[PDB]
Each structure stands twice: as C-alpha cells, then as structure tokens.
Symmetry: C2
Subunit: 423 residues, 2 copies
C-alpha cells in the first residue's frame, strides 16, 4: 500500500499549505496520510499562534488522516535535529512509505547527492570543512563553502550549492541525511514551493507567508487573514481567539524570558544546549542591559547570529534543556509516538501502527507511565520520561499566555483528549 | 555619645512613620540616627512600591542621618531572620547605642522576659513546646501556647502572652532575642504604635496603614495619598511615578511567578528554603492548576498557612534561595554593611564607622570585590559573594517591572550611586 508522511508546522494553516497537501496527495495517491507536526513551539523560536490541538483538528479536517506530535526537543532545534526527530518518528510508525516536502530547487537528485556527502563524510570534504571552520566562519557558511569546494573538486558545478541557501532545501537535505543515518526505507519526494518565502514578512494576496499572516493578525486585520486562510482553518482560528486561547505571539513571552534570564548566572547557560562562542557571556550581559526582548534579540544578535538561533537558545534556556539530555535525544532519537489526532479512517492505519510500530504509541496521556512499564519494546526509560516531561512542561508554560485567565487553568496534555473526527 | 538605630521598611513613608521617628529621636535625644532598611523587597512578601534609592532619599530627608541596606536574605524572611539580620547589622556598625521600635503593648520588660525564655531555652518550655509541636499545630501557635504554659507554671499571667499576637511585639521580641544571641550591648526602647495596624487594609485619614495607602494608590486616588504622606515623601513618590519607575505591585509580578513555578519540578522546592509540610507538593500542584497568582495564593493557603509565609516562599523560590545558604546566613549573619545613603552630618558618624565597624563597609558597588579582597576582617568570603549576588539579583529582577521600558535597562546597584544629601 501507500502511506504518505509529511513534516509540518502550520502556524497557521493557509491556502499554500492546502495546495501543498493537495499536490502531494495527488502525486503519491496514497491510501493514508500521516502528518508529524510541531507542538506549541515551532522551529523559528516562536510560539504557535494557537495551540497544538486546534491545529491538529485543522490538519484532520484538511485531509490528514493521523496527526502525530513531534517532540518539543526536536521541534525547537535547527534543521538537523528537526529532520532527525521527524524522520525518526515517521520511520518509527513503520507504516510510512512515501514522504513529500516543498522545495525551491525541485531537484531531488541534487539534495540526495548533498545528503550523501554530509552522511558518508568523505575525508576530503572533512579537511576542507576543517580548514573553513578554522578560518572563523559559522557552521552553515563553512559547510556551504566546503561543499562548494568538494563539488568543484569532483568536477561538478559548485554554483548549484547556492540552491541550499533556501530553507526548505536545507530541511529536505537534512531529512534525507537523517533517513540515511537511521537507515529508513522511506522514499522522499519534492514539490515546488509556490508562494511567499518563509522569511518574507510582507503580505501579498495568497499564498502569503506564515509570518506575513501572523503580522496581519497582529494588526487586527481579519479580512486579509480570512482571505489568506481556508474556511475551516479561519473558523477554528476565530474559534480559538473568541474563547480567549489566542492569538499568541513571542513578544508576550518576551518580558518573562528576559526577566528569567536576568535571574540565571554564567554557568546556567554553559549547561544549556547550543551555547558556544561566548554566547553565555552575551546572554548574561544583554539580559541585564536590555529593557525588552526585542532589544535583547537585537543585542545578542551580531553579523554571525541569526534571529532564529538566538530565539531557539532562549527557548532552550527557559525550559532548562541541557547538552547531555539533548545529546542522548540526538543519538537514540524520540522514545515515543504521541498521537495528537485521527479521523474515522485514521483508526485503521493507527490500528496497523499498533502492530508495526518500532516505538511505543501514546494516545491516553494519563496512562503513559503504564505504557512505558508494559511495553515490550527496548527503549531508554529515563530519556522517555525526560522527553515527555519536557513536552508537558512546554504545553503548561504555553498555557499561561492565553489572553483569558480562565483558560490558563490545568494541564492541557492530560485534560484535553486526542482529537477524533467522525465521518 | 548617643546613636539611635532603627529598623524600618517605609513602603511607603507616611505620617505615622514621621511621628514614630520624631517621638523616638525626642525620646533618645541622640547625636546621630542610623536606619537599617529593607531593599526592593519587604517582609510581607510584596515588592516595594518604589525602589530602595528613592526610599533612602526620603529617609534621609525625614531626619535619618545614614541609611544602610538590610540584606535581601534577611529582609524577605519571617520575624526571626529579619530581627537577626537587622540587629546583626546595627551591631556591626559598632557605633549604635540605642534602638527604638513601635509596639502595641508598650511593655519592654515583658518582651524581654519572653525573649529571655526563647533565648535561654529552659528544658521545661522545651518539653511543653515539644508536646504542642507533636500535637500538630504550627510554630507560632505552638510557641504561643508553650509560652502560656510556662507563664502559668512560673506563677505569672499567661493572658499577657496575648500581647505577642501583635506584629510589632513579635518583631521586638525577636530583636531582643537576636541581640542576646550575638551578644549586643544595644539598649532597646519601645514607643506605642499610633495608627492603623499593619494588617488593616482599610483607609481612615492619617495615619493609615501602609497597605491602606498602597490600596489607595491602586485606585489612583492621589488626594488621599497626598493627605496620608508628608510633603517630601509625596513629592519623591510622584517623582518616581511620573518618570515611570512606579508604582510597583505584587500582582504585576504574579504572572511571572506562576509561570516560573510551572517550569520547576518537585525537587526544586525541596531545595528552596522554608519548604516543609508538603508545601513542595502544594506548590507544584497549585502552580499547574491555578490561572493567576491571587488564585495561587488562595489555593496554597489553608487554615494553617498565612499569605505572608506563602509570599515569602514564592520570593525564595524565584531567586533560587536554598536551605544551606540560608542556614549559613542565619548562623554567621550578614557579611557586610551596605550604605544606601547619607547626609553631610552622616559622613561624620560614617567615618567613625570606618573605624569601629565589625563588618566590611560597602559604599562603591563596583569596588566591592576589591573591598572583600583588601579587608583585614575575618569574614566568610563565599557567603559574602552569594549574599551580595542575591542582593544585586533582587534589584535587577525588581527593575523589570518598571512601567517605563526605558527605565528597565542596566544594573541599578552599580549604575546608581549612594544618595548624598547636601546641607
């Protein structure tokens, strides 16, 4: 049979995402569609505009059969751990055959060559990369340059590597690389991304970028927002807004983040994952000097530091995510498959997953301890506990920023139940 | 000569405080007046309405010659450590002879008897207290009851002990007890407190309680506030408000405190000072269940838990103040005398203090390391560093809640300089 896996965020779900899903499904023509989705926190280092349950419901109503949660530790990282975690989950399902993503290049063979190079790690490219790293650049630039040197050395075209400056292509290459790391049989497909780039903050019609739409939400223009969204997506959006669970933006968390950083000392950041190049110093100082989170991001950021990375380090710092645990997670991968939602068609493939899963499947949250105790699968139990605790902590922290105080009460992992769509 | 020490908070400074200072100075007729004052955080577990520098300036302009800061670790505790720290500082000055405080009982001999009992710790009273503690009460009630039993056993009147249910009397008894603990020669005096009780939240004329005046500030009634304050005090108040450094209330910190508590686990609170009777549990749960800080305080509080104690534990939890460090501080006492301010008359007695001080004196904050290194006095250096770091951290955290973002920038311990009043 054919089961189409997809790696998604949907912050929010717009017409471009619908077009993507449609074209992908029509390309594969699968018997099922499984979607691994980010939680209440995305990759950019920004919180989701609405929580994961509403977005999972939207995903289900847009033609996704089953919605799985990507663990927060793999969600808030850069392309490497993100792709690692995602591919690991989709492979851990056991039923996933095909996986389709968006791309600017629309060249799969090229991305596969690049991923092959980054996987096999030839001694040549390692010498080059060693040199460029010693030259004082950052990792993305050093890897780009070294790959260009390898491509010129092998007689190929090094101007092709420019294609890899696009976000989706990086994500794809890292996907393939991860699959080659854990040895997944999953077939990967690319479809040309049509719309505004993810780094484009300006609104033009549809399909506007997620950032542009979020900005439109900030300005309280709901007509352009409604024009940029499908009917059901906009409906669920306004539903979550009117009940006081949204919208949620980073600047709301900003004061908390800064005040929390002012409390911590130099060592704390040296413990937290992703801290190097004296970023512990810069964090410690800028936290005390700046009066707001925007100014903080401006201060910490230099020519060599992107907004995304710094935001990621902020989220890693606020949850006390430490290098050791992150290393274990980046080695063994996720210890579980969390089920966010399913349709009536979803119960089928999910039931097959109950058999073919390489990882413990979690539906009822209150029972997850029982699941970890009664599972025949040989998983690290401590890593399991720490990961799921990080997920619950992330959701619980996300809940506080609900506009309505009444909605802030209780733990929404245990209280809320997996979204079930009747047909 | 005669130097009058006083233990104060001034949140804010009102007509009652002026009356107190006047009557005290007229009682002692000293040659100098030294005031040990709480920092940006008071005993009740609430932040000061305005920062410590403005309040120190007010204190200086109201006839206090020198203003010293009580270390945050002794400021945010209950009566025992508060009195301990205060008495320790005033004694550490070396120049302090007399100390006057307010009282409902206006009986010094009685408080001295009580303090004598609590100091010498007779075996009898210890058996009684052991029994009442085993009976399942809390410490204040058990001590009150045991003291009543001792007073009845010794033939004295046990209905006198009722006097000790008043806040000021508790503070006084603990003062005397502390002085008897570290062997201070300081003479203690009591003057009848005239005005509303500190636990009275309703506004009547003058002298209204500090809480009543703060509540009047919350309601934006500035005429009643102006009527409840001296000219200079009100002037400095409005000065700090208009420049956007005030007012500061606990509910503003509430969201931060709750969200910060949701991040921490069971063990964290077991590390933090003042946690027992399963308060770690209650904290861990109520933090996740409640949506606001008021509801949190309501939840954690039971028949046996006062608002003050819980607020104190909140402040202790947010600064990561741990039992060990607090024990060391409650043993050796403060390691330094921080100078908040002085007048031209203050330089004299301060210069004498440069000689007779039993503890290192700190004026310039940027130089405090140099001071700790070049001091001939035999003080614990690590305890010194940890304490002063806790002070700076407290101020830095307090700065974030300034209404004006522009005022949130920088560390105000190092940037701001000791208030100097020219005559």
């Amino acid at each position: 049979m054919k089961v189409l896996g997809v790696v998604v965020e949907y912050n929010p779900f717009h017409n471009g995402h619908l077009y993507h899903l449609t074209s992908a499904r029509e390309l594969v023509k699968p018997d099922y569609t499984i979607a691994v989705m980010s939680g209440n926190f995305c990759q950019r280092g920004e919180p989701a505009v609405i929580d994961k349950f509403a977005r999972a419901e939207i995903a289900l109503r847009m033609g996704v059969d089953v919605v799985l949660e990507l663990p927060v530790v793999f969600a808030t990282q850069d392309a490497g751990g993100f792709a690692f975690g995602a591919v690991c989950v989709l492979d851990a399902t056991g039923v996933v055959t095909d996986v389709v993503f968006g791309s600017e290049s629309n060249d799969i063979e090229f991305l596969q060559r690049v991923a092959r190079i980054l996987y096999e790690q030839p001694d040549e490219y390692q010498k080059f990369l060693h040199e460029e790293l010693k030259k004082g650049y950052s990792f993305p630039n050093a890897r780009k340059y070294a790959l260009m040197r390898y491509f010129s050395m092998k007689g190929w075209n090094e101007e092709e590597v420019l294609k890899l400056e696009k976000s989706n292509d990086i994500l794809g290459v890292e996907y393939i690389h991860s699959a080659l790391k854990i040895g997944s049989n999953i077939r990967f497909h690319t479809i040309k991304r049509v719309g505004a780039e993810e780094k484009d903050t300006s609104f033009r019609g549809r399909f506007s970028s997620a950032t542009a739409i979020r900005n439109l939400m900030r300005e309280k223009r709901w007509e352009e927002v409604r024009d940029s969204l499908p009917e059901d997506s906009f409906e669920i959006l306004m539903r979550e807004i009117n009940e006081g669970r949204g919208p949620v933006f980073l600047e709301n968390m900003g004061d908390f983040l800064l005040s929390f950083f002012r409390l911590k000392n130099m060592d704390f950041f040296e413990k937290i994952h992703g801290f190097s190049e004296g970023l512990e110093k810069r964090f410690h100082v800028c936290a005390r000097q700046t009066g707001s989170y925007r100014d903080f991001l401006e201060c910490v950021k230099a020519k060599r530091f992107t907004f995304s990375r710094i935001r990621r380090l902020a989220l890693f710092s606020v949850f006390e995510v430490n290098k050791e645990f992150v290393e274990k997670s980046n080695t063994k991968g996720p210890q579980y498959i969390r089920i966010l939602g399913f349709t009536e068609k979803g119960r089928e493939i999910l039931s097959l997953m109950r058999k073919k899963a390489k990882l413990p499947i979690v539906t009822n949250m209150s029972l997850y301890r029982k699941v970890l105790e009664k599972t025949d699968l040989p998983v690290d139990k401590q890593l399991f506990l720490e990961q799921i605790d990080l997920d619950v902590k992330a959701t619980n922290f996300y809940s506080m920023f609900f506009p309505s105080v009444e909605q802030r009460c209780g733990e929404r992992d245990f209280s809320i139940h997996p979204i079930f769509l009747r047909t």
